[PDB]
């Protein structure tokens, strides 16, 4: 599958994440 | 414009957003 | 199917409509 | 991440459901 | 127009369904 | 950006607005 | 709703449709 | 890369294609 | 909920997979 | 296929462009 | 939010932008 | 045209690749 990258930022921190596809 | 809900969620709290289109 | 929920806005008054799939 | 929200039917039996991204 | 097909499950039935755009 | 176009038809009248990208 | 605006060349024709939301 | 399939529809006729993410 | 098909492909070989909503 | 139509900018270099589906 | 990131191009002058959703 | 990056991961290997719009 693809794997898209997203700073998620709705947390308190900020932490890059993979969004799986 | 079109204005659909979402939670956003962190790392313990989350809360309502809207997202405008 | 699923029903998104969703508010069209225009001239300050919303509405809600579903977004059938 | 960010928890969108959709009424899941079936045959005639609807429950909202999460959907998480 | 594009007829995309999704298999659609309630309670253990499912049925293939077309969704046109 | 790509900034696509839609006619967004509210209450009281359409009207042809961006949505840039 | 939006109402998207795009030619149609799937058919013969390419024509120019509305596709709602 | 992810294939979607769907069907091209015309005025008449439809056919198979591909859709490559 | 929805069950999309699409194949995974990668190397001239693809496989089917099911993408869930 | 879709051809949906987009303005696509760069340095305030803007165009319409096709975008195939 | 999530921050996706894209290079936005303009006559081949590309850079890193972000789009929150 | 925007490049979004997503990683590809097939059956031999993954391989961070463009996605462009
Ligand atoms: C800003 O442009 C985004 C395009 O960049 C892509 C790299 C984004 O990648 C995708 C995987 C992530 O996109 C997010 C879902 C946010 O974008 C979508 C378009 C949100 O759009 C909203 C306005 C739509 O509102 C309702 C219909 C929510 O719809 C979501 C997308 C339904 O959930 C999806 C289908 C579940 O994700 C697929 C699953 C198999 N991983
Ligand atoms: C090229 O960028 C397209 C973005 O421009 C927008 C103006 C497009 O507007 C939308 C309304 C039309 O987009 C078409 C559906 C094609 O784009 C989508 C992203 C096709 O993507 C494929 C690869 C996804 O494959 C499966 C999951 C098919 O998914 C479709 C989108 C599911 O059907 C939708 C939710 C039904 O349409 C909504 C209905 C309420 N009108």
Same mark, same amino acid.
């Given at each position: 599958?693809? $794997?898209?990258?997203?700073?998620? /930022?709705?947390?308190?921190? /900020?932490? %890059? %994440?993979?969004?799986? $596809?």
């Amino acid at each position: 599958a693809l $794997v898209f990258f997203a700073e998620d /930022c709705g947390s308190n921190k /900020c932490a %890059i %994440i993979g969004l799986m $596809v």
